């Protein structure tokens, strides 16, 4: 009773009561919240690192894997087969590779060259060099990870200290070393901490496993946290394993009231002074050295060995944790103490053996007590997250100390269960090591990498490089020359049609005008009043009229009768009476004009298909319908494309506006060309607005090298197969169908919606301009995208929504770059043609996709700036629609009669 009692008093600060352990537990609860907080994480000692492992195994894992295991007492390489054969969950083979101190303490290159060489040997010996086995890496050090296949070393701990590795992605270092060998290929798909491999190994057997605990060379624990509490990982969805890195608890000085002179001494002379202070009071690397330090002081005070002190006793590292373990054995402990101490150079007495055994007891029991306190905090955290009175959970455990000391796991369990009386906790020893669990992570990581690879290969066909875009620009320019020249105009796909509008507004226009706006989303009738002079004004009124698809695709007589009925209504709606008014007809389809008021429809585009219209003068069609009604008369002065009316609407205020652009249902552009270049119209004086009809660019096969399988499908299923190919890669009627076709393919490949191609997904038109624009909105978090997808009729998850948003973005970004290339061609032609070093030009623009999409206009302006750097283009969105400009055109047309 005496000796032990006195030893108890000497090491009293090491004998922790439950009150102190509850205090430590509470401190650690606070650290865990600091490490998860976005605000305190940069200065949190307990890093709470995201692992990107979102679940314990579910039984679907299967495959043949390689697992590396580095940082614990032994470097192992394993081949793990999982459900690779019936009635064999797992099958493992393993090899330990000697890794001496000069490799662990040398350069990073030398360390990773060592790993790559042992891996080569391992694959060589088993002839698996050509199997393409996905590789998992258990690397037991704190790492910053933004994905499963990255592991940026934060700090070396334990025995390792290789230069050039802290702050580097060890997956890249390892890849580098393997490549340098040139001997074999290795696909490193996942990096995990050993706590995480332990939790996964144990979770394969026990579905309640939510914690992985290591009490070996070093000590650490991981646990399943809720995403809503993990501030540094986006999402509030589900769970994710957190690597606490609890060994650094106390590194800021918060456990200085628990630490003793011995702890300070072992810390000062370690590889990493001041760091991993909690770990140094607990793990196998340090407990025997803590005991040696205590014996040395005691000896110096004559409390042991009659003051005998040998140099062996004084040798750091000479008394290990295995000696502590042997000394604490029930029957042989004292005998083992005798032998061990005898080898120290002393001649220990029997009483010395009893004393030394008690010092081992106190050191190893304080460690067990400390880990019980920190693990108790994680269990209270899990209990709080689950929200129940009692906690049921399984802790997976590994580490030499826990596995080999004759009393530690028993004492740890008992203290743990006493500290957390509300939990029913099972401790499962991880007998297979981290490798099994690492393989389960590797199986899931490999499946997701394969799905990512195929998604990226599909989406890469929509990526356009700057050189490719310069080539599209060049092709547009060449097609513009083809359509303007007499010799080549008839077989040119970009028609470059004269509008007979020869100047922008000169400020003298004035009068009251009617206008029609047909071909976009809304058919409208308008009344426009323009007044010039002191303070010019424009006053406009309009009504929208529906045009059912049966009249858009019925007879020309029916369509024009319908337009005339709407005009009759609008005249009553406005109270218009009196002499017949001048009218400008915005008709957004390609027409061959012989003057401002005559336009023969060349072909239908978008969704129109009315019969007996193509090859007819549409002004004559309108005038015929007015005569059939025999009520009002009208003076149709002009037929205009919507590009041209949009340009004139903008040029009313801007002298630099010489270009019009539509990105709505369809896509097209117009611009002021020199009469000398307009070979199809006699005269070489002045300018003429040209309606490009650029939608048909590509209808001669000139964009076949960038059209995808999905563009081909959209055109093949369209109303005008083979026509308007460029427009079908850009505009609002067609982008949603490109997206829909990509989503169907991904759903069939099992990447989205559980492989379920619903009937909603098979319905054409679902990704309308409104919805595509909503899904990409920056200030719309997950819940709203899913809300939209679910609301359309699709069974979408958070991951589903993210992939849906990505696909939408790839398609709208390519449409905006393609539109940008065509616009870069037009502005450089104007610049180059006027012999200018720089051009300052305004483009009047309109269209629903352009107006509503969150990124299209920005991407498109950026593209034009990069592809035509000597042009400074300003894009001005019409507020008023094509109307103000159609009326301006009509005014000059009346004027030009006189
Ligand atoms: N909190 C503590 N810290 C350090 N040593 C302790 C502590 N509590 C008890 N001990 C010591 O642990 C030993 C008791 O071990 P215990 O696991 O409870 O029973 P057993 O004798 O079966 O191993 C005694 O040597 C006692 O002095
Ligand atoms: O440091 P140790 O004593 O080796 O214990 C910890 C080690 O246990 C082994 O079973 C695991 O496979 C390793 O991944 C782990 O690092
Ligand atoms: O097809 P949309 O989305 O309707 O866009 C194109 C249309 O935009 C309107 O603002 C113009 O006034 C119309 O003349 C033009 O045709
Ligand atoms: O090997 C057990 C533990 O040792 C150290 O504490 C490492 O920092 C940690 O990553 C690891 O899990
Ligand atoms: O409405 C925008 C454009 O749609 C189509 O591309 C029409 O062919 C064109 O004339 C019109 O400008």
UniProtKB/Swiss-Prot annotation:
Residues annotated as binding ATP 2: 517-522, 665, 732-733, 769-773, 848-852
Annotated positions binding ATP 1: 15, 69-74, 330, 410-411
Effect in UniProt of substituting residue 832 to K: In RP79; uncertain significance; no effect on hexokinase activity; no effect on protein abundance
GO CC annotation terms, alphabetical: cytosol; membrane raft; mitochondrial outer membrane; mitochondrion
Major place of residence: mitochondrion
Top-level taxonomic group: Eukaryota
Binding positions (D-glucose 6-phosphate 1): 69-76, 194, 217, 398-400, 434
Residues bound to D-glucose 2: 588-589, 605-606, 641-642, 667-668, 693, 727
Record localization: Mitochondrion outer membrane; Cytoplasm, Cytosol
Amino-acid positions noted as binding D-glucose 6-phosphate 2 in the UniProt annotation, renumbered to this chain: 517-521, 642, 665, 846-848, 882
Regions crossing the membrane: none
Membrane topology: Peripheral membrane protein
Region (Hexokinase large subdomain 1): 193-432
Major enzyme class: transferase
Pfam families: Hexokinase_1, Hexokinase_2
Regulation of activity: Hexokinase is an allosteric enzyme inhibited by its product D-glucose 6-phosphate. Hexokinase activity is inhibited by N-acetyl-D-glucosamine.
Chain spans, region Hexokinase small subdomain 1: 58-192
Enzyme Commission (EC) number: 2.7.1.1
Description of how the protein assembles with itself and partners: Monomer. Interacts with RABL2/RABL2A; binds preferentially to GTP-bound RABL2. Interacts with VDAC1. The HK1-VDAC1 complex interacts with ATF2. Interacts (via N-terminal spermatogenic cell-specific region) with PFKM (via C-terminus). Interacts with SMAD5.
Family: Belongs to the hexokinase family.
Name recorded for this polypeptide: Hexokinase-1
């Amino acid at each position: 009773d005496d000796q032990v009692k006195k030893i108890d008093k000497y090491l009293y600060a090491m004998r922790l009561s439950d009150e102190t352990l509850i205090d430590i537990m509470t401190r650690f609860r606070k650290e865990m919240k600091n490490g998860l907080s976005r605000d305190f994480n940069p200065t949190a000692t307990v890093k709470m690192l995201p692992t990107f492992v979102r679940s314990i195994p579910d039984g679907s894992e299967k495959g043949d894997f390689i697992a590396l295991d580095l940082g614990g007492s032994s470097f192992r390489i394993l081949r793990v087969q999982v459900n690779h054969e019936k009635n064999q969950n797992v099958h493992m083979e393993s090899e330990v590779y000697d890794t001496p101190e000069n490799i662990v303490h040398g350069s990073g290159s030398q360390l990773f060259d060592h790993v790559a060489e042992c891996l080569g040997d391992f694959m060589e010996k088993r002839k698996i060099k050509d199997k393409k086995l996905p590789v998992g890496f258990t690397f037991s050090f704190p790492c910053q990870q933004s994905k499963i296949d990255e592991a940026i070393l934060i700090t070396w701990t334990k025995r390792f200290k290789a230069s050039g590795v802290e702050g580097a992605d060890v997956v890249k270092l390892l890849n580098k070393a393997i490549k340098k060998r040139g001997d074999y290929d290795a696909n490193i798909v996942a990096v995990v901490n050993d706590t995480v491999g332990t939790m996964m190994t144990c979770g394969y057997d026990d579905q309640h496993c939510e914690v992985g605990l290591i009490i070996g060379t070093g000590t650490n624990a991981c646990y399943m946290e809720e995403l809503r509490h993990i501030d540094l990982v986006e999402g509030d969805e589900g769970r994710m394993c957190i690597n606490t890195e609890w060994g650094a608890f106390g590194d800021d000085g918060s456990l200085e009231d628990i630490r003793t002179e011995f702890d300070r001494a072992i810390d000062a002379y370690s590889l990493n002074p001041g760091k991993q202070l909690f770990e140094k009071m607990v793990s196998g690397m340090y407990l025997g050295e803590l005991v040696r330090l205590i014996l040395v002081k005691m000896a110096k005070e004559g409390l042991l060995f009659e003051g005998r002190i040998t140099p062996e006793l004084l040798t750091r590292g000479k008394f290990n944790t295995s000696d502590v373990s042997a000394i604490e054995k029930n029957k042989e402990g004292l005998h083992n103490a005798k032998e061990i101490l005898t080898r120290l150079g002393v001649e220990p007495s029997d009483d010395d053996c009893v004393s030394v055994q008690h010092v081992c007891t106190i050191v190893s029991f304080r460690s067990a007590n400390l880990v019980a306190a920190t693990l108790g905090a994680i269990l209270n955290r899990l209990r709080d997250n689950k929200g129940t009175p009692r906690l049921r959970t399984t802790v997976g455990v590994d580490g030499s100390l826990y596995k080999t000391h004759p009393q530690y796991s028993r004492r740890f369990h008992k203290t743990l269960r006493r500290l957390v009386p509300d939990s029913d906790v099972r401790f499962l020893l991880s007998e297979s090591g981290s490798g099994k669990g690492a393989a389960m992570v590797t199986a899931v990581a490999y499946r997701l990498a394969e799905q990512h690879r195929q998604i990226e290969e599909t989406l890469a066909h929509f990526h356009l490089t700057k050189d490719m875009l310069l080539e599209v620009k060049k092709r547009m320019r060449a097609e513009m020359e083809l359509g303007l020249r007499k010799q080549t105009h008839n077989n040119a796909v970009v028609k470059m049609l004269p509008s007979f509008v020869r100047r922008t507004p000169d400020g003298t226009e004035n009068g009251d005008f009617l206008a029609l706006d047909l071909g976009g989303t809304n058919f409208r009738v308008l009344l426009v009043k323009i007044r010039s002079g002191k303070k010019r004004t424009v006053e406009m009124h309009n009504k929208i009229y529906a045009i059912p698809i049966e009249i858009m695709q019925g007879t020309g007589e029916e369509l024009f009768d319908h337009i005339v009925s709407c005009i009759s209504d609008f005249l009553d709606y406005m109270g218009i009476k009196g002499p017949r008014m001048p009218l400008g007809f915005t008709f957004s389809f390609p027409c061959q004009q012989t003057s401002l008021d005559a336009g023969i429809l060349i072909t239908w585009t978008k969704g129109f298909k009315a019969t007996d219209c193509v090859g007819h003068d549409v002004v004559t069609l309108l005038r015929d319908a007015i005569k059939r009604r025999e009520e009002f008369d009208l003076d149709v002065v002009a037929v205009v494309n919507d590009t041209v009316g949009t340009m004139m609407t903008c040029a009313y205020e801007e002298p630099t506006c010489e270009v019009g652009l539509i990105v709505g249902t369809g896509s097209n552009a117009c611009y002021m060309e020199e009469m000398k270049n307009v070979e199809m119209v006699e005269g070489d004086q002045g300018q003429m607005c040209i309606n490009m009809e650029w939608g048909a660019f590509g209808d001669n096969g000139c964009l076949d090298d960038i059209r995808t399988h999905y563009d081909r499908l959209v055109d093949e299923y369209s109303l005008n197969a083979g026509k308007q190919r460029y427009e079908k890669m850009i505009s609002g009627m067609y982008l949603g169908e490109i997206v829909r076709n990509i989503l169907i393919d991904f759903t069939k490949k099992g990447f989205l919606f559980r492989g379920q191609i619903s009937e909603t997904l098979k319905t054409r038109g679902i990704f309308e301009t409104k919805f595509l624009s909503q899904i990409e909105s920056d200030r719309l978090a997950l819940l709203q995208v899913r809300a939209i997808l679910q609301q359309l009729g699709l069974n979408s998850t958070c991951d589903d929504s993210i992939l849906v948003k990505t696909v939408c973005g790839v398609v709208s970004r390519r449409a905006a770059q393609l539109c940008g290339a065509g616009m870069a061609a037009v502005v450089d032609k104007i610049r180059e043609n006027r012999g200018l070093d720089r051009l300052n030009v305004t483009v009047g623009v309109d269209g629903t996709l352009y107006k509503l999409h969150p990124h299209f206009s920005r991407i498109m302006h950026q593209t034009v700036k990069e592809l035509s750097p000597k042009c400074n283009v300003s894009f001005l969105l019409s507020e008023d629609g094509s109307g103000k400009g159609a009326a301006l055109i009509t005014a000059v047309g009346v004027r030009l009669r006189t």
